[PDB]
């Protein structure tokens, strides 16, 4: 299995900037595609962003397209979500999830129902 | 028994705005992709617009493309067609049509939409 | 994404005529081969590229099944670039095809031992379908060398022909069920599977 | 191969009656129309008559413009043969009469589209 | 379309080495099972070898088992038959056949989807 730890988050202004860092330990991180999801106490898991296992194609949700930046650093074994242009409705627990390639395999044009979920980090956009 | 009841329509001048509504009963609205069809007086049926089962995507015919909007409310089992910048040729009896099969796809291009259920329809007329 | 209703299509009680092949779509669910493998009596499989059965858990954006019924030999014609009868006026798939087609024989799933005549097929419409298309409906084919007016006139046919209702002459004339699992990948949000 | 055998014809007095029997073998009439053509001195193979079995309850008869209302065309499946009944003969009727079936079903009135040609039968009208 | 083009073959002395090359132009060639078949004049196409890409299992005709090697390269969209120490019986028209896979089973040589144009191989004793 893999252990995913989220760092960052907290209280930020509306229109401010934060960076959520998901660090993976265990099996090889570089061989998995990764994504960020949000879940607020009033909404169910929605797809925020996704970076393929090769880090050559990025997918964004309709609500955050062109506003959030998802990147991968294999050397640092990390996935970074730069959140900017925030609004109060963005408040949620953000989870980083990794899609297993050893067990089921993937090919990124658009895939992934991530089977491993991190602890989650609280993000509160208050103006 | 499946019921598709239409509301709206009437006489309007070209360039105006109308909102056609269709309420569906007797079947699960959200499980079937829905269509709007128009039957002009003295002409065959023409497909207006189509909306997937969940409303994720919409498609229009070239004669109405870019000015007509098809939308749906699955919770209320309601289908809406917002018509704007109309031409006089849009005069017809408008039906909201249910699809034979279900689950979110019966049209990508061309094709011939076999509609298993039609409504009573509403008259729409565009004349100066 | 839980297990799909993917198994219901194959274990269904109704299959539309080939000229009215059903284009169903499935999304937001994981389609495993564990959903339907307990009744594996599938005569023929074909796949171009990775398939849900090759990779137990595998996700796709747009997965659509083309379901219909056709007699044995013409099952051979369900493939890119094929020509003749079924591949020209009832169903067509792109020459650049990346998907799967599954055919399994049955002679009692149509609720008759002599087959059904309710599954029709069209022969000749002038011009052949190119990739996914449908234009077949109950109508009278007109002219072809000499004009006519309705019915089976001078050099005019009825486009739809009926399969037999008498006992079949073997698997070659039995009503094979065919499901084309043509799927595609495109830039989209994740957690959509098929 | 599909084999067509023509019987009848011969020399018959002008103003008489005749019957031509074309036996077809190698296939059974299901949808295939059968066409009677005539080749005359200085004339190509042109439409004379045609018969098509719709396949539900009824048979469809095609009579050329200059032979309409004067000739009859019928068929029997059990003996897989086609009857052409001819009355009120005229001298110009003399010709080689062929019965033809198409390689498929394309066209009902077209000489070149029919790729099976029988051995034909000579028919002469003179008293 | 699925096009299988042959190369190699020809005349060879009995006991020599040959490489039969079949290049495949199809759609996602990597997901096909490969077979090499032969036809001798006045006979039906018969089995020579096969490899199932899903499990990496190779079967050879008992007459050519342990001397022939059938291989497939997805990167080059390619299939090779390396024939070592050919025998007179090997003289025939050799076809490369690609059958579809990702199925309940893996032994589809009875479906007969498509095969190549064939290449002449003649082994002189």
Could you characterize the architecture of this molecule?
It is classed as viral protein. Keywords: SARS-CoV-2, Spike protein, nanobody, broad binding, viral protein. The complex is a heteropentamer of chains A (127), B (128), C (194), D (127) and E (125). Chain A has 127 residues and is an all-beta fold. Chain A has one domain (2-125): Immunoglobulin-like. Chain A is 0% helix and 49% strand. Chain A has no helices and eleven strands. In chain A, a hairpin with a 4-residue loop joins strand 7 (69-73) and strand 8 (78-84). In chain D, strands 2, 4, 5, 6, 9, 10 and 11 form a seven-stranded mixed beta sheet that branches. Chain D starts with a strand and ends with a strand. Chain D has one domain (3-125): Immunoglobulin-like (Sandwich), CATH 2.60.40.10. Chain D is globular, with a radius of gyration of 14 Å. Chain D is 0% helix and 48% strand. In chain D, strand 5 and strand 6 (59-63) form a beta hairpin. In chain E, a hairpin with a 4-residue loop joins strand 5 and strand 6 (57-60). Chain E has strands at 3-7, 10-13, 17-25, 32-39, 46-52, 57-60, 68-73, 78-84, 92-100, 114-115, 119-124. The A-C interface holds A 35, 37, 45, 47, 50, 57, 59-62, 103-107, 109-114 and C 1, 30, 50, 55-61, 185-193.
Q: In brief, what are we looking at here?
A:
The complex is a heteropentamer of chains A (127), B (128), C (194), D (127) and E (125). Chain B has 128 residues and is mostly beta strands.
How many structural domains of chain E? Answer: 1
List the helices and strands of chain D in order.
EEEEEEEEEEE
Number of helices of chain E: 0
Largest protein interface, residues of each chain: A-C, 21 and 19 residues
What gap, in angstroms, lies between the N and C termini of chain D?
Answer: 39 Å
Main sheet specs of chain E: 7 strands, mixed
Number of domains of chain D: 1
Disulfide bonds (chain C): 4-29, 47-100, 59-193, 148-156
Protein name (chain C): Spike protein S1
Region (Immunodominant HLA epitope recognized by the CD8+) (chain C): 116-124
Region (Receptor-binding domain (RBD)) (chain C): 1-194
């Amino acid at each position: 299995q893999v252990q995913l730890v989220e760092s960052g988050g907290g209280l930020v202004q509306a229109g401010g900037s934060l960076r959520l860092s998901c660090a993976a330990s265990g099996r090889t991180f570089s061989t998995y595609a990764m994504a960020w999801f949000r879940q607020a106490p009033g909404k169910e898991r929605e797809f925020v962003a996704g970076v393929a296992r090769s880090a050559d194609t990025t997918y964004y949700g309709d609500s955050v397209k062109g506003r959030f930046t998802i990147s991968r650093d294999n050397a640092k074994n990390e996935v970074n979500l730069q959140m900017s242009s925030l609004k109060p409705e963005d408040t949620a627990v953000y989870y980083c999830a990794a899609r297993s390639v050893i067990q089921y395999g993937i090919v990124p044009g658009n895939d992934f129902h991530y089977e491993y979920w991190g602890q989650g980090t609280q993000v509160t956009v208050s103006s | 028994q499946v019921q598709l009841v239409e509301s709206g329509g009437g006489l309007v001048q070209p360039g105006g705005s109308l909102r056609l509504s269709c309420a569906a009963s007797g079947f699960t609205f959200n499980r079937y992709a829905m269509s709007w069809v128009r039957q002009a007086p003295g002409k065959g049926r023409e497909w207006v617009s189509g909306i997937y089962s969940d409303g994720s995507e919409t498609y229009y015919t070239e004669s109405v493309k870019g000015r007509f909007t098809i939308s749906r409310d699955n919770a209320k089992n309601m289908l809406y067609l917002q018509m704007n910048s109309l031409k006089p040729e849009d005069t017809a009896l408008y039906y909201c049509a249910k699809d034979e099969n279900a689950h979110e796809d019966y049209f990508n291009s061309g094709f011939d939409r076999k509609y298993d259920y039609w409504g009573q329809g509403t008259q729409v007329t565009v004349s100066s | 994404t839980n297990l799909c209703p993917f198994g219901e299509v194959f274990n269904a009680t109704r299959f539309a005529s080939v000229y009215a092949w059903n284009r169903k779509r499935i999304s937001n669910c994981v389609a495993d081969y564990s959903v339907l493998y307990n009744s594996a009596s599938f005569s023929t499989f074909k796949c171009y590229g990775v398939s849900p059965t090759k990779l137990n858990d595998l996700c796709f954006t747009n997965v659509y099944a083309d379901s219909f019924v056709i007699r044995g030999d013409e099952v051979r014609q369900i493939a890119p670039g094929q020509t003749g009868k079924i591949a020209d006026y009832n169903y067509k798939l792109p020459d650049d095809f990346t998907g799967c087609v599954i055919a399994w024989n049955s002679n009692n799933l149509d609720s008759k031992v002599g087959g059904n005549y309710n599954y029709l097929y069209r022969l000749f419409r002038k011009s052949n379908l190119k990739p996914f298309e449908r234009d077949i409906s109950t109508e009278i084919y007109q002219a072809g060398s000499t004009p006519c007016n309705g019915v089976e006139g001078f050099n005019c046919y009825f486009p739809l022909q009926s399969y037999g209702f008498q006992p079949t002459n073997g698997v070659g004339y039995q009503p094979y069920r065919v499901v084309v699992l043509s799927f595609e990948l495109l830039h989209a949000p994740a957690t959509v599977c098929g | 191969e599909v084999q067509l055998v023509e019987s009848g014809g011969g020399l018959v007095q002008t103003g008489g009656s005749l019957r031509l029997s074309c036996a077809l073998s190698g296939y059974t009439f299901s949808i295939f129309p059968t066409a009677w053509f005539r080749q005359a001195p200085g004339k190509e193979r042109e439409f004379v008559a045609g018969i098509r079995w719709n396949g539900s309850t009824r048979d469809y008869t095609e009579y050329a413009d200059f032979v309409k209302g004067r000739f009859t065309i019928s068929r029997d499946n059990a003996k897989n043969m086609v009857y052409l009944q001819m009355i009120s003969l005229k001298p110009e009727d003399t010709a080689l009469y062929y019965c033809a079936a198409s390689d498929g079903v394309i066209d009902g009135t077209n000489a070149n589209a029919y790729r099976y040609w029988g051995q034909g039968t000579q028919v002469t009208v003179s008293s």
